[PDB]
Design a protein around this ligand. Sequence first.
Ligand SMILES: O=[N+]([O-])c1ccc2nn[nH]c2c1
Length: 301
Amino acid sequence: AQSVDQLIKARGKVYFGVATDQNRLTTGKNAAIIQADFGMVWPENSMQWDATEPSQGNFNFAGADYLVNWAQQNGKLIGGGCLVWHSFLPSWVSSITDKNTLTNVMKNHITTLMTRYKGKIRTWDVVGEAFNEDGSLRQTVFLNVIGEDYIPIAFQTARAADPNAKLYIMDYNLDSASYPKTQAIVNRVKQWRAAGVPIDGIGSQTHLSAGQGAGVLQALPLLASAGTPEVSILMLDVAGASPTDYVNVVNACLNVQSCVGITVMGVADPDSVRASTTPLLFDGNFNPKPAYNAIVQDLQQ
Ligand SMILES: O=[N+]([O-])c1ccc2nn[nH]c2c1
């Protein structure tokens, strides 16, 4: 059984990665599969805001430290995130109505996480899910209280905290070139970078239904046209796990020079949030599914 990470490196890419955390690494056969087959790990939950700063200035790094130490011992690259994401905010953040207060809170959260792991993290997802489906900016507490400047502020703060890390904006429903969100993230990233905002990458949080892989072949080149040094596929899963969809996503990555790699949402189907759709690359016995073998064969050829 061949390693997709090794094979994608042989094709000139950086990694094939996976999301995990302490719970997964101590159960099933997740650790053994990650050791063999994946070259980068991301914390699924242990670096989100609610996990790391459940009360203001009272940080909890136990789960994140476990992941980082496991990755270093096993020679894996590490991704971290998401530093600013409305979906994982504790209530103490959402209640803040004062611009200066919230700006300092946000800067402190960013700097504290990034400093702790300085030099050890390849990629940080700095801002997540900042766009509405129509391409307008999502009206989260950060937009409502700080305004549109919160995104530049987050990236400039992140660059200062660890200049080694590649800083990404991420979003979902960027899977079709003509979708309004895809157009808008491309346009705004172009503008931010032209003003000197340090956005190194766009990460596409790719949750596909059956048959949607084909559209990624056109959407990913469009995302790359924003001119960031890197793009990536993140959080990848596919309802039904058809080889056709998975191979299309891999081929999109191969066709886009700036696409550094792909991260899947987990290891085995039963641990998915949509397990009924069996959307991952390993089954409930931890055997590689037809889609895994198809990706291997595509990368070997
Ligand atoms: O690619 N990922 O699986 C992944 C998981 C959780 C994250 N939080 N921020 N960015 C993330 C990427």
